[PDB]
Design an enzyme around this catalytic site. Structure first.
Site, mmCIF file in Angstrom:
data_model
loop_
_atom_site.group_PDB
_atom_site.id
_atom_site.type_symbol
_atom_site.label_atom_id
_atom_site.label_comp_id
_atom_site.label_asym_id
_atom_site.label_seq_id
_atom_site.Cartn_x
_atom_site.Cartn_y
_atom_site.Cartn_z
ATOM 1 N N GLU A 1 32.137 11.921 -4.600
ATOM 2 C CA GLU A 1 30.828 12.254 -5.198
ATOM 3 C C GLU A 1 30.316 11.119 -6.096
ATOM 4 O O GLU A 1 29.120 11.013 -6.351
ATOM 5 C CB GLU A 1 30.887 13.574 -5.975
ATOM 6 C CG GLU A 1 31.124 14.802 -5.086
ATOM 7 C CD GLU A 1 29.919 15.132 -4.245
ATOM 8 O OE1 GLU A 1 28.850 15.433 -4.829
ATOM 9 O OE2 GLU A 1 30.032 15.081 -3.002
ATOM 10 N N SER B 1 34.581 21.418 -11.633
ATOM 11 C CA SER B 1 34.390 20.690 -10.371
ATOM 12 C C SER B 1 33.166 21.074 -9.545
ATOM 13 O O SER B 1 32.958 20.517 -8.459
ATOM 14 C CB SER B 1 35.651 20.737 -9.518
ATOM 15 O OG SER B 1 35.917 22.058 -9.109
ATOM 16 N N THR C 1 36.640 11.005 -7.182
ATOM 17 C CA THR C 1 35.985 11.719 -6.091
ATOM 18 C C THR C 1 34.870 10.918 -5.452
ATOM 19 O O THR C 1 34.154 10.178 -6.121
ATOM 20 C CB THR C 1 35.402 13.099 -6.556
ATOM 21 O OG1 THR C 1 34.574 13.642 -5.527
ATOM 22 C CG2 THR C 1 34.550 12.973 -7.815
ATOM 23 N N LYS D 1 32.610 12.295 -13.746
ATOM 24 C CA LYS D 1 33.780 11.779 -13.013
ATOM 25 C C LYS D 1 33.795 10.245 -12.974
ATOM 26 O O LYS D 1 34.852 9.624 -13.071
ATOM 27 C CB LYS D 1 33.858 12.366 -11.589
ATOM 28 C CG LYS D 1 34.403 13.790 -11.550
ATOM 29 C CD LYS D 1 35.942 13.707 -11.613
ATOM 30 C CE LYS D 1 36.612 15.036 -11.522
ATOM 31 N NZ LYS D 1 38.087 14.877 -11.700
ATOM 32 N N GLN E 1 43.798 24.041 -5.664
ATOM 33 C CA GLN E 1 44.311 23.606 -4.369
ATOM 34 C C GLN E 1 45.268 22.440 -4.519
ATOM 35 O O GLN E 1 46.407 22.495 -4.034
ATOM 36 C CB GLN E 1 43.154 23.210 -3.443
ATOM 37 C CG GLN E 1 43.609 22.649 -2.098
ATOM 38 C CD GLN E 1 42.459 22.181 -1.244
ATOM 39 O OE1 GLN E 1 42.176 22.779 -0.221
ATOM 40 N NE2 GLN E 1 41.794 21.092 -1.653
ATOM 41 N N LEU F 1 44.354 16.658 -12.683
ATOM 42 C CA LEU F 1 43.558 17.320 -11.653
ATOM 43 C C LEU F 1 42.582 18.362 -12.205
ATOM 44 O O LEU F 1 41.757 18.877 -11.459
ATOM 45 C CB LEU F 1 44.462 17.954 -10.572
ATOM 46 C CG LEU F 1 45.641 17.121 -10.039
ATOM 47 C CD1 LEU F 1 46.248 17.800 -8.809
ATOM 48 C CD2 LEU F 1 45.236 15.682 -9.702
ATOM 49 N N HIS G 1 38.839 17.186 0.932
ATOM 50 C CA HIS G 1 40.074 17.668 1.536
ATOM 51 C C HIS G 1 40.219 19.194 1.411
ATOM 52 O O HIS G 1 39.869 19.798 0.393
ATOM 53 C CB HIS G 1 41.295 16.898 1.012
ATOM 54 C CG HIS G 1 41.334 16.764 -0.480
ATOM 55 N ND1 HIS G 1 40.463 15.956 -1.177
ATOM 56 C CD2 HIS G 1 42.140 17.335 -1.404
ATOM 57 C CE1 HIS G 1 40.725 16.041 -2.468
ATOM 58 N NE2 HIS G 1 41.741 16.869 -2.632
ATOM 59 N N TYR H 1 28.090 16.240 -12.822
ATOM 60 C CA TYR H 1 29.494 16.243 -12.367
ATOM 61 C C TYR H 1 29.941 14.840 -11.942
ATOM 62 O O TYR H 1 30.949 14.316 -12.437
ATOM 63 C CB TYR H 1 29.716 17.250 -11.214
ATOM 64 C CG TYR H 1 31.046 17.076 -10.497
ATOM 65 C CD1 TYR H 1 32.246 17.450 -11.109
ATOM 66 C CD2 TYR H 1 31.109 16.496 -9.226
ATOM 67 C CE1 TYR H 1 33.477 17.266 -10.472
ATOM 68 C CE2 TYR H 1 32.349 16.311 -8.577
ATOM 69 C CZ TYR H 1 33.515 16.704 -9.205
ATOM 70 O OH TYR H 1 34.728 16.538 -8.561
#
Ligand SMILES: NC(=O)C1=CN([C@@H]2O[C@H](COP(=O)(O)OP(=O)(O)OC[C@H]3O[C@@H](n4cnc5c(N)ncnc54)[C@H](OP(=O)(O)O)[C@@H]3O)[C@@H](O)[C@H]2O)C=CC1
Ligand SMILES: NC(=O)C1=CN([C@@H]2O[C@H](COP(=O)(O)OP(=O)(O)OC[C@H]3O[C@@H](n4cnc5c(N)ncnc54)[C@H](OP(=O)(O)O)[C@@H]3O)[C@@H](O)[C@H]2O)C=CC1
Ligand SMILES: Nc1nc2c(ncn2[C@@H]2O[C@H](COP(=O)(O)OP(=O)(O)O)[C@@H](O)[C@H]2O)c(=O)[nH]1
Ligand SMILES: Nc1nc2c(ncn2[C@@H]2O[C@H](COP(=O)(O)OP(=O)(O)O)[C@@H](O)[C@H]2O)c(=O)[nH]1
Lengths: 338, 332, 338, 336
Positions: free
Chosen positions: B119, B76, B117, B145, B11, B72, B171, B141
């Site tokens: 998260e 994920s 993120t 990150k 995305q 990116l 998003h 995860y």
């Protein structure tokens, strides 16, 4: 009795912990990256070199770890192995991460699939606080790592926390502040200082060259800190603990106090990169500063509040900083004499 | 200027590719229905790069000579990260450091964006969350990150590298993967509308999220990178909506008028127009920690703020899936 | 003078090589994974610990390697660093390959990009011959590796050959047969034997436990072997050379001869796993055999023919197996005596 | 229904092997395709994530799939690329092999393992023809890495009594072969020249000698190796060389050209006897002088122990490829 597996068995903490666990009636198994006739030097000094079973297990090799857990069936695992030099971590960040971050997860995964009821201790560190967000630091202080070492160790802390929370595994993260002893490696500032001063006294070395003299550390006595590791693993529930003295001193002060015991009366002149430690008795420069020993991003001050460990574990520091410096200087004077 | 985008097929990679091309960048993507959908598949130069190994990254950097790198690429998925924590860490944590260390070694003047993120906030330590909220990751995860975020910070601080970490809250867009709840909702409702599916099965409808519009978030990524000095930013709307609100608003676009009956696991959505029970809550998804960003720093420093509203966001996603379902699954 | 970079600087070969190069007027730089106060024990024995500049470089970290070549600008690189333990290679095969195979390619790539005119020496090994296809083995003997160590080293050999051939880089592969000294690590059979016997004599240890006593090796004297490394690097053209004594003995023979020098008169009783070495004087078991020290796939016999090295380099072995045993036994008796 | 795990499922060999295994009633898992679609098997193969660059995902994959047979055909297989990216090549083609072996050893040591080795390992050939007993002499980082793959497989067999086989395969070709390869270049180009889409086919030394077999027969050898009571390594080859000239001429005859060869070496040219036009030439971009290293395999051990031999002749092979490329150019590049 209980089987303990200690990674980093031939390091300062591994040695003292093995001694403690042996006294408690454990079978002690250890893995280390240190090999050769002098690798077990620390275990030899403690008189336990015949009492520890050394096995080959590298934190970088998942299948070797799996086999080790399968074969040892440990009741308790203390993960003390690490690439533990902060300065080197800026030069070898990826290897540092693979050992200090991912290796923790490799052990946790091996335990999860082979022997999930195993108790796990992770050797976390006050280095994770880095550019400290609170003073003093506690278990609730936000982290701010300032080296690849500290970032990797932070992963190791949070992954241990996550396996405890997500899998109900008995996994503890010990947030230990700098702790030292005559078994401390000479790569580290405290032992560097005492080892060097002893050699300077007996004319085997010209000068002691350091980096940041202004750095402040909370320095404790390692034998007491491994007791804390054992104690948190004996609690009915797993949790994380700051282990510290609550007292902070500069590198400068360490040098002054050490040097006094060695027979030097230190006075400082100049500033920063140009600062020098002079024996007042002779006018000779004993200590100098080199940019080489400064870290790309520094940790200016660490000081811990071990209140939680007092209330829940009955742990408290006993050895004073001044006692620590004497213990270390005296041991190194003796060594250089012999 | 040359930009190198990892995760080009996602995305955010696709929308970012679009934006950068519009700004006159040469765009390299490290390895697409999304790029086709955007009509830019022949305008992006695809190159091999694997975050799992270091030497190929060095070579990629040497070949491309990028002015800007946007990382990116990620494993994920949170559920997958519990099954495959080590692979997750290799890609989402070590892979970040591999890129930084390659830049450090062969092209240290390169600007670097890390896709962080919300998260990372996990068991939230403050509400709302800002750049100064302590992190509390709750999955391998989120832990991986977090390493990615801090290592980016460290490269900035240690080496004065231009390295930015974007702490992005949820998003969404028509390019959102079907794996994700927002697409699940819009895609299911369109299928229900056309009688291809009977109902939509969800978790706790009370659950709150800060949902923004993806193209505006990739704009924040670029803006961060154009500043004189590198820094980290929370990018978010600063308002939460419930899953229930998302569903109702999407349902309305589809021609439903949802009446809610029951609470918790018992809650169901009944269309007032037909009487059909079209939404249900499952034991599988139901869970009995409000993630919401405060993006004032991004406004103050970047002049960035959300433009598309939540109602518009939902409409954008619903109209796209209504059209997709028509085109693929319904007779003319 | 000329600058040399030696990886594995604090191991047996690195230590002796550094000493040789210093005598030749080189500036000597070294990288080694061994750290701490006893890491430089070998350099301390040779009296060269202050003449070698130690830098941090791990064979696992490509960017660290690149930076090291950039800073040092070496005229000659000797790649002596390795996970060099055959038994451990079966337990940690991937790590073994990463250091012993890919690490060689990492250095070569770094040289190709930083300083392509650098002379490169790779520390290859008779172990590559494994289940030997010719007897004696020469540069033209087909390889047959029998451990992950030997497979990794075989890659290390062939990649060095390939860089020589494809890039016209001055790259040499030394095919060195087993070579020993008082600096040999105690993990290796020969030093294990002498170290253990000295300790048995003095009642620091009860028994020496070994694996395959039937194994046959060509054993040379390490100082003479590092001479050969230097010699091949000084030739007009780069090439590969077997360096060996040409004489083969069993591990059993090594034990017998070493024990005699130590004052034990060994009698072998039993067969295979049950074979035991008894001191004829006391009736006590000095030596026994354990399954744990056997390798999953064994190398029964190695014996080299170094005639190319004589003809081209003027190199010949001078120290005999019998002399080597005395040299090693004598040093270990002295060490334990202190 | 036995379970097979195939790495490199998207390749020529991955696709034909998947086809063969399905035909034999296997459940087939491919580790991650126009080739699979062409074979009509795209929906019969279970595609799963695996990456040879990383160890833990391999372990998990083996645990989940529980395969009876693993065929490791995944590789960075380009020689030129291997000089540019030698480390990545070694990570995939050498260490990747060990990763799979070590995963099987850890969680399923009864699994049979096939390693895709290659005649490139012989490099500067130490015997002509080459057998399983010919000494290796690799001449690229691709070949050096593959050599590690071979020997580590041998070691796992010998050290642990694991069922592990290394197939030393010489060149094999088919319609599924990639365009980067000379056989497809020849057949594809000649199909385009026939239909007026191209003027000439430009090559290197026409005297270049190759051992070329038919890919489906070679994957059959892979399966055969894995069905023996005992694991072992085999050279799989035709045992005969043909020249690039012979490939082109036979190919050209299928395209409707009657090629007369005029000149020698770099100046050699293929001229159509019917039109007088130069169909084929030699360029300095592709030309290399007389090759001393003739790669040609003696597959007598494969015949003796597996009953394996090539069945599709060289002429049949060329025809197969040319008919496929004529059809492709007709279907996609020329109007009805
Ligand atoms: N000491 C302190 O004040 C504090 C230390 N720490 C942590 O405590 C732990 C122990 O401290 P300390 O005793 O000083 O550390 P040491 O450096 O003295 O010992 C660490 C040991 O880990 C071994 N090791 C390194 N890499 C690996 C690997 N790949 N696999 C297996 N073993 C490996 C080393 O072997 P080798 O010698 O061969 O390299 C070494 O013996 C470490 O985790 C350290 O980071 C945290 C807070 C405070
Ligand atoms: N000695 C012999 O008879 C023969 C030896 N060989 C080869 O010769 C070379 C040297 O022999 P020897 O002196 O006995 O070997 P040693 O084991 O004594 O020395 C090797 C050194 O390499 C270091 N090292 C290990 N891994 C790495 C790595 N990750 N990065 C950087 N350094 C590392 C070790 O450090 P640490 O102590 O911390 O692990 C060690 O000091 C080796 O390559 C060996 O395989 C070949 C033929 C014969
Ligand atoms: N290791 C080391 N540290 C030094 C030296 N000179 C000053 N320091 C400082 O002393 C502090 C403690 O360093 P060290 O003992 O290595 O442990 P650390 O807390 O992990 O950095 C750090 O802030 C260093 O910057 C030196 O020569 N060596
Ligand atoms: N390392 C070691 N080797 C032993 C032992 N007992 C017998 N050996 C044999 O001695 C031979 C030489 O081994 P080593 O010194 O380790 O060098 P190697 O040639 O690299 O294996 C090998 O065949 C071993 O199997 C032992 O206790 N330790």
């Amino acid at each position: 009795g209980k089987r303990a597996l200690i990674t980093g068995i031939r390091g300062q903490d591994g040695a003292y912990l093995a001694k403690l666990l042996l006294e408690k009636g454990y079978e002690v198994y250890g893995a280390d990256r240190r090999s050769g006739e002098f690798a077990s030097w620390r275990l030899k000094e403690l008189g336990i070199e015949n009492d520890v079973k050394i096995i080959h297990m590298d934190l970088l090799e998942f299948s070797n770890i799996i086999r080790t857990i399968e074969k040892v069936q440990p009741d308790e695992v203390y993960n003390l192995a690490a690439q533990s030099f902060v300065g080197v971590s800026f030069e070898q960040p990826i290897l540092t991460a693979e050992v200090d971050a991912i290796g923790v997860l490799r052990i946790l995964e091996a335990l999860r699939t082979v022997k999930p009821d195993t108790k796990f201790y992770q050797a976390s560190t006050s280095e994770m606080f880095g550019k400290v967000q609170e003073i003093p630091q506690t278990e609730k202080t936000p982290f701010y790592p300032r080296s690849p070492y500290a970032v990797a160790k932070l992963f190791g802390h949070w992954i241990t926390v996550n396996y405890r929370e997500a899998y109900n595994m008995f996994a503890c993260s010990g947030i230990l502040f700098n702790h030292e002893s005559p078994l401390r490696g000479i790569e580290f500032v405290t032992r560097k200082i005492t080892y060097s001063l002893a050699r300077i006294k007996y004319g085997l070395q010209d000068k002691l060259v350091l980096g940041n003299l202004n750095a402040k550390r909370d320095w404790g006595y390692a034998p007491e800190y491994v007791e804390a590791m054992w104690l948190m693993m004996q609690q009915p529930e797993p949790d994380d603990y700051v282990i510290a003295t609550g007292e902070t001193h500069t590198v400068r002060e360490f040098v002054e106090k050490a040097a006094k015991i060695a027979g030097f009366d230190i006075e400082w002149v100049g500033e920063g990169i140009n600062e020098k430690g002079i024996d007042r008795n002779t006018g000779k420069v004993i200590v100098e500063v080199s940019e080489e020993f400064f870290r790309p991003a520094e940790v200016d001050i660490l000081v811990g509040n071990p209140e939680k460990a007092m209330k829940k574990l009955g742990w408290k520091p006993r050895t004073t900083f001044d006692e620590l410096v004497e213990i270390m200087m005296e041991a190194d004077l003796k060594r250089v004499r012999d």
